[PDB]
Amino acid sequence: YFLSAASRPLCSGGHASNKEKEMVFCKLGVLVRHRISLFGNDATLHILGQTLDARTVMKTGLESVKFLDNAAEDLEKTMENLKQGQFTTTVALLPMLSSLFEHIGQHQFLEDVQVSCYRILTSLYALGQRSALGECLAAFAGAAFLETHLDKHNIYS
Numbered sequence: 001y002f003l004s005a006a007s008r009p010l011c012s013g014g015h016a017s018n019k020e021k022e023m024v025f026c027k028l029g030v031l032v033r034h035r036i037s038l039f040g041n042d043a044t045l046h047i048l049g050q051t052l053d054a055r056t057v058m059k060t061g062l063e064s065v066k067f068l069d070n071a072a073e074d075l076e077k078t079m080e081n082l083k084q085g086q087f088t089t090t091v092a093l094l095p096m097l098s099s100l101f102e103h104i105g106q107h108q109f110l111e112d113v114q115v116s117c118y119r120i121l122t123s124l125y126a127l128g129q130r131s132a133l134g135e136c137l138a139a140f141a142g143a144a145f146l147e148t149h150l151d152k153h154n155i156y157s
Contacts, residue, residue, distance in 0.1 A: 005047065008040065012050035019054075020061030022070055030062055030070035038080035044087050051084075052095035059102035066106045074112055078119035085123040096124075097132050100155060104136040107148055114140065114148035121154035130156055 015033045022030035037051070062070060081099075103117035117136070133156050137149040 004040070008047050009050045011036070011040075012047065012054040015051070015054040016057035016061065019058035019070065022058075022062040023064050025069075026067050027062065027065075027069035030058065031073055033058070034070060034073045034077040034080075037077055037084075041080035041084040041087070044084070048085075048088055049092040049095065051081075052092060052099065055102065056095045056098035059098055059105060063105065066102075066109065071106055071110060071113055074106075074116035075119060078116035082119060082123040085127065093129075097129055100129075100132045100136060100151075103148055103151070104132050104139070107136060107140040111145060111147065114145070114151070117148040117151040118154065121151035124155035128157070 015036060018033045019030040022028075058070075059066075099120060100117065103113050103120065106113035133152040137152045140146070140148050
Protein backbone atom coordinates (compact mmCIF):
# COMPACT_ATOMS: atom_id res chain seq x y z
CA TYR A 1 0.00 0.00 0.00
CA PHE A 2 1.35 3.41 1.06
CA LEU A 3 2.37 3.00 4.72
CA SER A 4 5.60 1.17 3.81
CA ALA A 5 7.09 4.41 2.47
CA ALA A 6 5.93 6.36 5.53
CA SER A 7 7.89 3.91 7.69
CA ARG A 8 10.75 3.81 5.18
CA PRO A 9 12.37 6.85 6.88
CA LEU A 10 11.82 4.83 10.04
CA CYS A 11 13.39 1.99 8.06
CA SER A 12 16.16 4.34 6.89
CA GLY A 13 17.01 4.87 10.54
CA GLY A 14 16.83 1.11 10.94
CA HIS A 15 18.96 0.36 7.88
CA ALA A 16 21.69 2.60 9.28
CA SER A 17 21.34 1.14 12.79
CA ASN A 18 21.18 -2.56 11.85
CA LYS A 19 24.24 -2.09 9.62
CA GLU A 20 26.14 -0.26 12.37
CA LYS A 21 25.45 -3.46 14.35
CA GLU A 22 27.55 -5.24 11.70
CA MET A 23 30.75 -3.62 13.03
CA VAL A 24 31.53 -6.68 15.16
CA PHE A 25 26.20 -14.39 11.32
CA CYS A 26 27.98 -11.31 12.67
CA LYS A 27 27.37 -8.93 9.76
CA LEU A 28 24.25 -10.83 8.63
CA GLY A 29 22.11 -7.94 9.87
CA VAL A 30 23.67 -5.84 7.12
CA LEU A 31 23.09 -8.83 4.84
CA VAL A 32 19.49 -8.66 6.02
CA ARG A 33 19.50 -4.88 5.52
CA HIS A 34 20.90 -5.24 2.00
CA ARG A 35 18.12 -7.79 1.55
CA ILE A 36 15.75 -5.20 3.02
CA SER A 37 17.01 -2.65 0.48
CA LEU A 38 16.16 -4.96 -2.40
CA PHE A 39 12.87 -5.81 -0.65
CA GLY A 40 11.57 -2.31 -1.32
CA ASN A 41 13.25 -2.15 -4.74
CA ASP A 42 12.20 -5.43 -6.39
CA ALA A 43 8.54 -4.58 -5.68
CA THR A 44 8.76 -1.16 -7.36
CA LEU A 45 9.56 11.99 -1.03
CA HIS A 46 12.95 12.51 0.63
CA ILE A 47 13.69 8.77 0.83
CA LEU A 48 16.40 9.26 -1.82
CA GLY A 49 18.40 11.20 0.75
CA GLN A 50 17.12 9.02 3.59
CA THR A 51 18.28 5.74 2.05
CA LEU A 52 21.59 7.18 0.81
CA ASP A 53 22.39 8.56 4.26
CA ALA A 54 21.43 5.16 5.67
CA ARG A 55 24.13 3.64 3.46
CA THR A 56 26.42 6.54 4.37
CA VAL A 57 26.10 5.52 8.02
CA MET A 58 26.38 1.90 6.87
CA LYS A 59 29.69 2.58 5.12
CA THR A 60 31.04 4.37 8.20
CA GLY A 61 29.48 2.35 11.02
CA LEU A 62 30.62 -0.96 9.46
CA GLU A 63 34.07 0.20 8.30
CA SER A 64 36.04 -2.26 10.44
CA VAL A 65 36.51 -4.92 7.73
CA LYS A 66 36.86 -2.70 4.66
CA PHE A 67 32.91 -10.20 9.21
CA LEU A 68 32.23 -10.46 5.47
CA ASP A 69 28.45 -10.79 5.13
CA ASN A 70 27.59 -7.37 3.69
CA ALA A 71 30.01 -7.28 0.75
CA ALA A 72 28.77 -10.56 -0.75
CA GLU A 73 25.26 -9.35 -1.65
CA ASP A 74 26.57 -6.01 -2.95
CA LEU A 75 25.80 -7.07 -6.53
CA GLU A 76 22.18 -7.46 -5.41
CA LYS A 77 22.25 -4.27 -3.33
CA THR A 78 23.72 -2.05 -6.06
CA MET A 79 21.15 -3.35 -8.54
CA GLU A 80 18.53 -2.55 -5.89
CA ASN A 81 19.70 1.07 -6.05
CA LEU A 82 19.54 0.69 -9.84
CA LYS A 83 15.88 -0.37 -9.68
CA GLN A 84 15.09 2.26 -7.03
CA GLY A 85 17.26 5.11 -8.33
CA GLN A 86 15.16 5.48 -11.48
CA PHE A 87 11.94 4.62 -9.59
CA THR A 88 11.38 7.97 -7.85
CA THR A 89 21.45 19.16 -3.39
CA THR A 90 23.98 19.15 -0.55
CA VAL A 91 22.24 16.38 1.44
CA ALA A 92 21.49 13.89 -1.38
CA LEU A 93 24.34 14.36 -3.86
CA LEU A 94 26.74 14.56 -0.92
CA PRO A 95 25.75 10.99 0.12
CA MET A 96 26.33 9.84 -3.47
CA LEU A 97 29.98 10.71 -2.82
CA SER A 98 29.69 8.38 0.18
CA SER A 99 28.27 5.70 -2.14
CA LEU A 100 31.46 5.55 -4.21
CA PHE A 101 33.43 5.93 -0.96
CA GLU A 102 32.12 2.52 0.12
CA HIS A 103 33.34 1.15 -3.22
CA ILE A 104 36.64 3.01 -2.78
CA GLY A 105 36.66 1.77 0.83
CA GLN A 106 36.01 -1.88 -0.01
CA HIS A 107 38.60 -2.02 -2.82
CA GLN A 108 41.24 -2.45 -0.08
CA PHE A 109 40.12 -5.90 1.08
CA LEU A 110 36.91 -9.23 -2.87
CA GLU A 111 36.29 -7.81 -6.35
CA ASP A 112 32.49 -7.93 -5.97
CA VAL A 113 32.57 -4.35 -4.65
CA GLN A 114 34.11 -3.40 -8.00
CA VAL A 115 31.23 -5.11 -9.83
CA SER A 116 28.81 -3.27 -7.55
CA CYS A 117 30.51 0.06 -8.33
CA TYR A 118 29.99 -0.60 -12.04
CA ARG A 119 26.44 -1.63 -11.11
CA ILE A 120 26.21 1.74 -9.37
CA LEU A 121 27.83 3.23 -12.48
CA THR A 122 24.80 2.02 -14.45
CA SER A 123 22.42 4.14 -12.36
CA LEU A 124 24.89 7.03 -12.13
CA TYR A 125 25.49 7.35 -15.88
CA ALA A 126 21.74 7.30 -16.56
CA LEU A 127 20.96 9.65 -13.65
CA GLY A 128 21.50 12.74 -15.82
CA GLN A 129 32.87 13.75 -6.95
CA ARG A 130 36.12 13.55 -8.91
CA SER A 131 38.10 13.04 -5.69
CA ALA A 132 36.47 9.75 -4.65
CA LEU A 133 36.19 8.43 -8.22
CA GLY A 134 39.79 9.47 -8.88
CA GLU A 135 41.10 7.65 -5.82
CA CYS A 136 39.18 4.51 -6.83
CA LEU A 137 41.05 4.35 -10.15
CA ALA A 138 44.77 4.43 -9.30
CA ALA A 139 44.43 2.55 -5.99
CA PHE A 140 42.58 -0.39 -7.60
CA ALA A 141 44.69 -0.89 -10.73
CA GLY A 142 47.16 -3.74 -10.31
CA ALA A 143 47.14 -4.93 -6.69
CA ALA A 144 38.75 -7.84 -13.94
CA PHE A 145 40.50 -5.77 -11.27
CA LEU A 146 39.89 -2.57 -13.26
CA GLU A 147 36.09 -2.85 -13.08
CA THR A 148 35.86 -0.11 -10.43
CA HIS A 149 38.37 1.98 -12.39
CA LEU A 150 35.96 1.58 -15.31
CA ASP A 151 33.29 2.92 -12.94
CA LYS A 152 35.28 6.15 -12.59
CA HIS A 153 34.59 7.45 -16.10
CA ASN A 154 31.09 5.92 -15.98
CA ILE A 155 30.13 7.84 -12.81
CA TYR A 156 32.10 11.09 -13.07
CA SER A 157 29.56 12.45 -15.57
